[PDB]
Design an enzyme around this catalytic site. Sequence first.
Site, PDB file in Angstrom:
ATOM      1  N   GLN A  82       3.681   3.817 -11.197  1.00 23.38           N
ATOM      2  CA  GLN A  82       3.450   2.504 -11.775  1.00 23.38           C
ATOM      3  C   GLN A  82       4.743   1.869 -12.257  1.00 23.38           C
ATOM      4  O   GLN A  82       4.693   0.849 -12.952  1.00 23.38           O
ATOM      5  CB  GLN A  82       2.466   2.592 -12.943  1.00 23.38           C
ATOM      6  CG  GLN A  82       1.121   3.204 -12.606  1.00 23.38           C
ATOM      7  CD  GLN A  82       0.337   2.394 -11.608  1.00 23.38           C
ATOM      8  OE1 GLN A  82       0.393   1.164 -11.609  1.00 23.38           O
ATOM      9  NE2 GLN A  82      -0.409   3.076 -10.751  1.00 23.38           N
ATOM     10  N   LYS A 133      -1.856   4.791  -1.218  1.00 21.81           N
ATOM     11  CA  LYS A 133      -2.432   5.158   0.067  1.00 21.81           C
ATOM     12  C   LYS A 133      -3.939   5.270  -0.087  1.00 21.81           C
ATOM     13  O   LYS A 133      -4.433   5.616  -1.156  1.00 21.81           O
ATOM     14  CB  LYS A 133      -1.860   6.478   0.584  1.00 21.81           C
ATOM     15  CG  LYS A 133      -2.270   6.776   1.994  1.00 21.81           C
ATOM     16  CD  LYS A 133      -1.659   5.747   2.905  1.00 21.81           C
ATOM     17  CE  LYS A 133      -2.145   5.886   4.325  1.00 21.81           C
ATOM     18  NZ  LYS A 133      -1.713   7.145   4.958  1.00 21.81           N
ATOM     19  N   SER A 182       6.517  -6.167   5.417  1.00 18.64           N
ATOM     20  CA  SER A 182       5.319  -6.266   4.603  1.00 18.64           C
ATOM     21  C   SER A 182       5.641  -6.843   3.241  1.00 18.64           C
ATOM     22  O   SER A 182       4.795  -7.488   2.623  1.00 18.64           O
ATOM     23  CB  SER A 182       4.677  -4.895   4.464  1.00 18.64           C
ATOM     24  OG  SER A 182       3.499  -4.979   3.698  1.00 18.64           O
TER      25      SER A 182
END
EC number: 1.4.1.3
Lengths: 125, 496, 246, 246
Positions: free
Chosen positions: B79, B121, B376
Site C-alpha cells: 500500500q 493480482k 498501462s
Amino acid sequence: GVTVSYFEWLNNLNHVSYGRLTFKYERDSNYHLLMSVQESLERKFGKHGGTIPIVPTAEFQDRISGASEKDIVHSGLAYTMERSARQIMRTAMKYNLGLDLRTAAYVNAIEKVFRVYNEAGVTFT
Amino acid sequence: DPNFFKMVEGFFDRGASIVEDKLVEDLKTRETEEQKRNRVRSILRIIKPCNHVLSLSFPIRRDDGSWEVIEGYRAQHSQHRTPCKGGIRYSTDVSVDEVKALASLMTYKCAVVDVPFGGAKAGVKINPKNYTDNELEKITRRFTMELAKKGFIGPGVDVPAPDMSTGEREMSWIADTYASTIGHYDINAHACVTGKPISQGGIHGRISATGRGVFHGIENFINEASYMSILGMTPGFGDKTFVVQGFGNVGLHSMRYLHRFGAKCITVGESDGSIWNPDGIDPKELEDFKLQHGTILGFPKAKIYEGSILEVDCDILIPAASEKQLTKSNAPRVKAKIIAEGANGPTTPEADKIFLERNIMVIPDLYLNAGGVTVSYFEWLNNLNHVSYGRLTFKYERDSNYHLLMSVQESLERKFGKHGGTIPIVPTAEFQDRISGASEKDIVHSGLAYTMERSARQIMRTAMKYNLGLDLRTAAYVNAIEKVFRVYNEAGVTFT
Amino acid sequence: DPNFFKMVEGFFDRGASIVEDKLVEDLKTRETEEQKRNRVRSILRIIKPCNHVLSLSFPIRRDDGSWEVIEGYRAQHSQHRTPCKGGIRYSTDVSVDEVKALASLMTYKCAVVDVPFGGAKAGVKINPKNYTDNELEKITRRFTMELAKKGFIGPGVDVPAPDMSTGEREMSWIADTYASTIGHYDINAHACVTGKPISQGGIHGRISATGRGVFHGIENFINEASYMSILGMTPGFGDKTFVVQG
Amino acid sequence: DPNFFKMVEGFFDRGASIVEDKLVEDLKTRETEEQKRNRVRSILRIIKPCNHVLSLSFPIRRDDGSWEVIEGYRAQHSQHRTPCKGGIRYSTDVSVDEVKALASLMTYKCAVVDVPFGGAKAGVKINPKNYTDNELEKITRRFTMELAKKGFIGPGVDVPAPDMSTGEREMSWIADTYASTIGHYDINAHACVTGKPISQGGIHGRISATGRGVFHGIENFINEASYMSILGMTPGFGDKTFVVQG
Ligand SMILES: NC(=O)C1=CN([C@@H]2O[C@H](COP(=O)(O)OP(=O)(O)OC[C@H]3O[C@@H](n4cnc5c(N)ncnc54)[C@H](O)[C@@H]3O)[C@@H](O)[C@H]2O)C=CC1
Ligand SMILES: NC(=O)C1=CN([C@@H]2O[C@H](COP(=O)(O)OP(=O)(O)OC[C@H]3O[C@@H](n4cnc5c(N)ncnc54)[C@H](O)[C@@H]3O)[C@@H](O)[C@H]2O)C=CC1
Ligand SMILES: NC(=O)C1=CN([C@@H]2O[C@H](COP(=O)(O)OP(=O)(O)OC[C@H]3O[C@@H](n4cnc5c(N)ncnc54)[C@H](O)[C@@H]3O)[C@@H](O)[C@H]2O)C=CC1
Ligand SMILES: NC(=O)C1=CN([C@@H]2O[C@H](COP(=O)(O)OP(=O)(O)OC[C@H]3O[C@@H](n4cnc5c(N)ncnc54)[C@H](O)[C@@H]3O)[C@@H](O)[C@H]2O)C=CC1
C-alpha cells in the site's frame, strides 16, 4: 516558495512528474530540425561537396542530456516572477505612485481580489 | 524445476542480504549502531508479506437455468503507493499461493521503472473454454460488484488489467459495471481498468507494448561500452544476429523493431516446431504465412529445424515461452552471449550460477517485461486527464517549427541575400512524415523509450555500487528493494 | 416551413437507413446473417430516443412580496460518454418537445468533432425582459439546487453552458450556488459550468469561438482539390468574395 | 363520465375557495389586510402543481436476443415532508397526465390520516401479460438503477409500493437491486420499498389493510349520534344490512 508550493500541488494532482511524456519526444524534434537545416543548405552549397555539420552547442547539449523536472520548475518560476512584476510596474503608473512599490503591490492584490467578489454575487440570498 | 512461489521469495531474501549493510550506514537518526540494525531488518520484514488477500464465492446462474459457485481471489501486496495495479487471470489452476506470488512480483516490477502504483493480482477458477459469451459477462460483471463493495476496485484503490484468457472485452464489462453502480458520482469512474478497447478510453499502440519494451531493453545494454567488451562484441545492432522462441504476442511485435534496425533474425521456433535460416527471415512474410494457417511448419524461405531451439547458435536469444525453460539441462549449450528474458521466470536459479561462470549477460525479466506496465500507466492518465495526448499542442508546435525554418532562411538571406540566391529551408521527407502523421501514438512510443532507458542506467549503476559484475537480476531486485525501502522509512510505518 | 423536432429525427432515420448495411458486414461475432440485422436495427432504436427528461416547479418570491411558479425542463439525451453538456435557455416558448430535439442534436454535434461528453439541454419558461436583476438570480440560484439534488448538475454528470438570453452573469450564479451547497467537499467544484467570466475560470477567446470555427470550417474544404473542381473554382481564398447575413 | 385529472384538480380549486377566508383571519404577522390575501392565494398556488416529474427510457434485451425500449415515469408531488410514498403501476395506458394526478391525490390522502411522508407515483408502459418472468425482473431491476441514480428511490427520498399488476415479487426485486448497488453502505437499505414479502421485512396482516380500513371507516360514523339522526337510523351495526360490489 509559494509558487513552487503550487507546482507541487499540481504534481501530486496529475499523478505524474513533469515532462516524463515529452522529454524524449521534444529531443527528437530538435535533431530533426538541425538535420533539416543541414540538408537544406547542402542542396545549395552542396554541389561543392563540403559537408556542414550542424550540431548542438556544448551548453545546449548539457541541457538535453540532463533535462529533468527540475528544469521545468526553475522555468515556470522565472515566468511567474516576471509576468507579475510587469503588473506592479504598470499599477505604479496608473495611479502615479512613483517609486512607492509596496503600495502598488497591495493595490494589485486588492484590485484583483475585488474582481472576484464583485462578479460573483457575494450574498447567497 | 522448482516451485515458483519459493523462487520469488527466494530472490527477495537474497537481495535483502546484500542491501542490508550499505543501508544501515546511510541512515540519519539518533540511535545506536545496533538499534539501526533492528530498524532495517524490521522494515524488510514488513515489505515481504502481502498486506491484503481476499477470497470470494459467486452464485452464477448457468444458461440452462442451473446454478453453480464461482470462486475468486485478489491479493494487494503493498500500500506504499496507491492505487494498486494487477491483471485478472481466468484459469482452473489459480491457487491462493500463486496469487500472492505474482502480486509481490509487480510491486517490484513497477518499481524498477518508476511507475507509482503498487502491486496486485486476481484470479478466478474457471475455464473460459467451457462457457458461452453470456455466461462470461455474468461471471465478470458480478466479480466486480462483489469486489468493489469491499474496496478492491476503483480509480484510486485498484486498477485491474488484462492477462491470460482475459482480453479487451473483459475490460469493457468491468468498466461499465463499475461506472454505473458504485462509481456513478465519480468523475474518474472510467479510470478503474486499463486495457479497454480504443473506443472507450484505451490508448493506441498497446498490443505492441511489451514488444517495444523488449526492444529498448536490450538497446540500452548493447550500447553500453563496458558490458560489451566483457562479452566480446561491439556496440550497435550491426552484424548482430538473434533468435526468437514463442512466436506470438511478445515475439512478433519484437522481431519487427529489431529487424528494422539491422539485427538479423535467424531462427524462430514455437511450441509445435522451429525454423532455421542462417540467411535471415522477414518477419512480415513469416507472419503472413501464419495469418491463414495457424502454424509455421514449412515456411518457404527458411528450412526446418526440430528439437530444442535454446541450444541453437545465436547471439541474442529470447525465451518468449513459458516459465522454467532453461536449466542445468543445457546451460553450457546456448552458444549465445546474451539472454534477454521475455516472460516470467525463464531461468532456474541453477542456470543463473552457470551463466555467471560462462560470461553470459542474462538480462532479468523484472526489467524487460516491464513494457505493458508502463503503457498501462499511460492509459490510466489518459482516462484521468479526460483528453488525449497532444490534442492541444500538435498544431501549436507545428507552427513553431515552420517559424524557426523561416527564421533561418531570413537570417541567411540577410548575409548571402544580396547575391539574390534564395535558400529554400524545408523539412526532410522523414520529418514531414513525422508532422503530418503526428498522433497520440507517437507520444506513447516516446514516453516508453524514455522509461526503458532512464531505468537501465539505474541498474547499470547499482551493478557497480555493489560490485555485482554481470549479475543483473540481483541488481534489478536491489534497486526495487532500495526504493521501496525509502518509502517506509520516511513515512513512519506505524500509525501509533 | 416544417416542424423542427420532425426535421432532426428525420435526419437520423434517414442516415440510419444508409449506414445499416455497411455496418452489418463489419461486425465480428458468432451469429447468423439475420441475427446481426436484429442487432443493428436494435441498437439504432436505443440511440434514437432521449434517456432522461425532467420537469420542475419553483416557488419564487417576487420583489413585491408576491409568489409565482417557475417551470423548467432538462433532457439528457445519451449516457454513452459522461458528462453531458448543454446550454440553458430562458424563453416563454420552451416546450418539452424542443428540449428533447436540441438535446439529441448535441450528442451528434459533439461527436463529429470528437468531443467526449454527450448531449443535454435545459429551458425555463420566463421572459428575462420582465424581471429585475435580483429576481433573475433568485430564479437561477434555485433552478440549480432543485436540479443538483436530483443529479443533473455536476463536474462529472452535467455541465450547463450559456445560450440565448443567458450570458456570463448567469453562469456565475450557477457556479457559486453549486460550489457552496453540494459540491463543497469536491475538488472539481468549479468545473460544473462553462462560459463563466474570465475572473472565475473562464477561458480567453471564447466569444470568438463560433467565429473562428466558421472560418476553419470552410478553409478545409476550399483547399480540397476535388470538391472544388466540381464547383468550378480554384483553391484558396484568393479572388473569392463572400457575403454575411445577420 | 368526465376526464379524471380534471376531477382531482377540480376538488382542490373548490376546496381552496372555501378555506381561503377562514385562513386569512388566523394568520399572525405585520401586514395589511390585503398583503395577507396575496400571501394565502400565493401559497395555494405553490401546493397545487407537482414539483418533480421524470421520464425514462430503457434498453431491455428480450429473451430471444432482441432489444426494445421501455418507457417509464415518476412524479413526486410535494416535498413538504419526506420521504414520498407512491405505488408503481404496469399498464400500457400510463400517461404522464395520470401520474401527475394520482401523485397529488396521495399528498392529500396521507394527510387526512396524519401519515408523514408526501405523495408520489410511478408507471411503466408495458403489459405484464406479454412478458416472461425473467423479462419482468430485467425490466424491474433496471427501472430502479435508472431511478436511484437520479435520487428517486431511497429510505429517505422515495418509497415505492405495490399497485395494479405489481405484487410482492416486484417489491423483492426492487429491494435487492437497491440494497446491493447503491444503498450498500446504508444501514436503512431495506427500507426503500414497502409491500415486500414477509420473509424479507414485510409486516403481517397487510393484504387485509384496506379491508380493516373500510370497516373502521364506517364504524366511526355509524356511532356518531348526530349524522345518524339526519339519515334516519340508530347507531350500531345492529339491524343494519349492507351490500358489496366487486
Ligand atoms: N538520484 C537517483 O539515484 C535517482 C533519481 N531519480 C530521479 O527522480 C526524478 C524523476 O523520477 P520519477 O519517479 O519519474 O519522479 P517523481 O518526482 O514523481 O519521483 C518520486 C520519487 O519516488 C521514486 N519512485 C518512483 N516510482 C516509485 C514506486 N513505484 N515505488 C517507490 N518509489 C518510486 C523515484 O525514484 C523518485 O525518487 C528524476 O529527477 C530522476 O533522476 C530516479 C531514480 C534514482
Ligand atoms: N502479452 C503481454 O503483454 C505479456 C505477456 N507476458 C508473458 O509472456 C508469455 C507469453 O507471451 P504472450 O504475450 O503471452 O504471447 P503469446 O500468447 O502470443 O505467446 C505464445 C507463444 O509461445 C509459444 N509457446 C508456448 N509454449 C511453448 C513451449 N513450451 N516452447 C516453445 N514455444 C512455446 C507458442 O507457440 C506461441 O508462439 C507468458 O508467459 C505471458 O504471461 C508477460 C508480460 C506481458
Ligand atoms: N481511423 C479512423 O477512422 C479514426 C481515427 N481517429 C483517431 O482517434 C485518435 C484521437 O482521437 P480522439 O477522439 O481525440 O482520441 P481518443 O483516444 O481519446 O478517442 C477515443 C475514440 O472515441 C472516438 N470518440 C471521440 N469522441 C467521441 C464522442 N463524443 N462519442 C463517440 N465516440 C467518440 C474517437 O474517434 C476515438 O476512436 C487519433 O488516432 C485519430 O486518428 C479518429 C476518428 C476516426
Ligand atoms: N388540535 C387539532 O386540531 C389537531 C391536533 N392533532 C394532534 O397531533 C398529535 C399527534 O398527531 P401526529 O401527527 O400523530 O403527531 P406529530 O406530533 O408527529 O404531528 C405533527 C403535526 O403535523 C401534522 N401532520 C401529520 N402528518 C402530516 C402530513 N402528512 N402533512 C402535514 N401535516 C401533518 C399533525 O396534525 C400535527 O399537528 C395529537 O396531539 C393530536 O391531537 C392532530 C390533528 C388536529
